[model samples]
Target: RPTFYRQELNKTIWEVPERYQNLSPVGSGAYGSVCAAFDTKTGLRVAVKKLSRPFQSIIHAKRTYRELRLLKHMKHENVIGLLDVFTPARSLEEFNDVYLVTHLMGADLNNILTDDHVQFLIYQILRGLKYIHSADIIHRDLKPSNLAVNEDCELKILDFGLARHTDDEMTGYVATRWYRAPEIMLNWMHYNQTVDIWSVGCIMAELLTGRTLFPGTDHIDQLKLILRLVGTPGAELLKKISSESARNYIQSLTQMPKMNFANVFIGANPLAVDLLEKMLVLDSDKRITAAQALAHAYFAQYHDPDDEPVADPYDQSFESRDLLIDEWKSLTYDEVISFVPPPLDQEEME
Candidate 1:
């Protein structure tokens, strides 16, 4: 007999740990459906993610294995943490559904909140991103919804942006592209940590106005929307674009004078507007790094070099290596057993 009870979770059956109580569906995404449950052991509500079908293919299995490994190693106050894991499968052969338990956030940044709130939140985003980049990982997709927040104003970047891998899976993520840097869209450079700050600028602008900064119905116009405010790039920038088509297309666009930062945000903090331009530039080379952005005048009151932490560079071999589903299962099993929850974040403010 199964040690766990066979019960329905959103659309499927889950033989989860008995300690997970009062289960109810929260929401469903391309990755999988999430269910909210109370953990009797910890007295905390947690989100349980059921992989949409990890074993559907070797590619999917590799991603599933990689995500688990990444989460288990990431440690920071503003980064999401893995609390626990469970599986009903008694052996490797039966390992079907793997459940990841994490702190359930009250709202996403899109859920909305003020000026003070915006600065603090932006600082937190850069804070977390600094830690992530230092760890040798680029949180490629960052947006309002991708950032989860609790009622106490605590924020943590969600850890599931790596799940999408196809054109079909990609459409559900138009939001992801709006915040993306032009270097990525045009393949201008082997974009690094700088791309992440480009998204941060978009998010900060979104927070400033309740409206999305750049709303493009298509990728073509998406570039237009960005360049409209940023103005046309110089010949030097055009020369470095990765693709001939992209470079030619960009050259063909009608050039316009760059809009002044103050006029764009109108009545927003002068320093905030300055920081936005620093981040929202068409040139990734000139864009501000997370740590530099944190030190900007806008965050002068909040920046604390001593408190902000950087992590050891992450070992990215797991992604580079290839393996079968059985091998993935074994590696994941090793991680789950050896998994240790990081020290609790010492959150300030109430």
Candidate 2:
């Protein structure tokens, strides 16, 4: 019973589009306040994010622009698809608010955790990542909360705030602390696409055991927690670590032997253990790539090369420039109003 003009959430008025109904708050974060709504036109439920102060700062504006463009361009079954984007603003002067609409997933990956769900959910994840990675972009923030799932065991990867095309030089840190790759936490070397693989590996472990595999309090504890499980790397790997300080820290620690994942997982399918071992490797080079993990025997029941897709390379030229907040507001405004969602599926019709 709400219309675009007069609905309030979190003490702030939200101007939603005409087609969406029954808006209610779902979650709120530093950047946006999210709400769930039903699409009257298609009979599908969706979530819409009302960006907070989109033009408040250059940093805010750029992030808003980047997320919109990335979501608009990357479309796949395993990747969250943008259904409708609308702005109540009529002109550039009034274009301070933006709302992004996407399918309301049944829950985050945490909601469902059977070993059967784990295999298929992870399969969908790799299927989605293969598309994103093929475009030369690193998700940079792959974590459980970012993975949207449904009761049917379908999964879709979302959140693009920290992603960028692969650069020769990489950031020392990325992703949530527990799910971050060892290279990122240790700053041992410039991280690349393999960073996402490590996160997937962590998710797999958590899925199997129903708890975090490495719950470190800080990067100091993080490295130790990692070595506690994956064990210490030898001189060959240590020598290749790019940072002297990082390598020194590792050498200073009392060496711990690698913990057997099978022993840890206890009665899990041996194939899952093998895939997990390959993914959680201390050395980034040794970690299994996304497509490679899909081909692992663990997914033999679900692996389909034709079903796994790769996106055409994405161009990061727009995201590289430093634009003023107003400039970003204009660019984002154009994108916000121009999108048309894909046609409705038969399933959504009732």
Tell me, what's the RMSD of every candidate? 3.2, 3.0
Best candidate, lDDT? 2
Give Cα-based local distance difference scores for all models: 0.78, 0.80
Residue-wise C-alpha lDDT for candidate 2, range 254-273, written one tens digit per residue: 98898878789998888889
What tens-digit string does per-residue lDDT give for candidate 1 at 1-350? 22476677655987777888888887864367888888776678888888777767666677777778777777788998788877777777777777888888888887763678888999999999999888878877788887888887889988533733323333133336678787776566657788889999889998887778888777788888988888888887776676788877677888866899798888788888989989998777788999899899999888998999998767767765667888887888777667765554655322
**Predicted model with the maximum TM-score:** 2
Clashes of 2: 0
What TM-score should be assigned to candidate 2? 0.93
- Count of backbone collisions within predicted model 1: 0
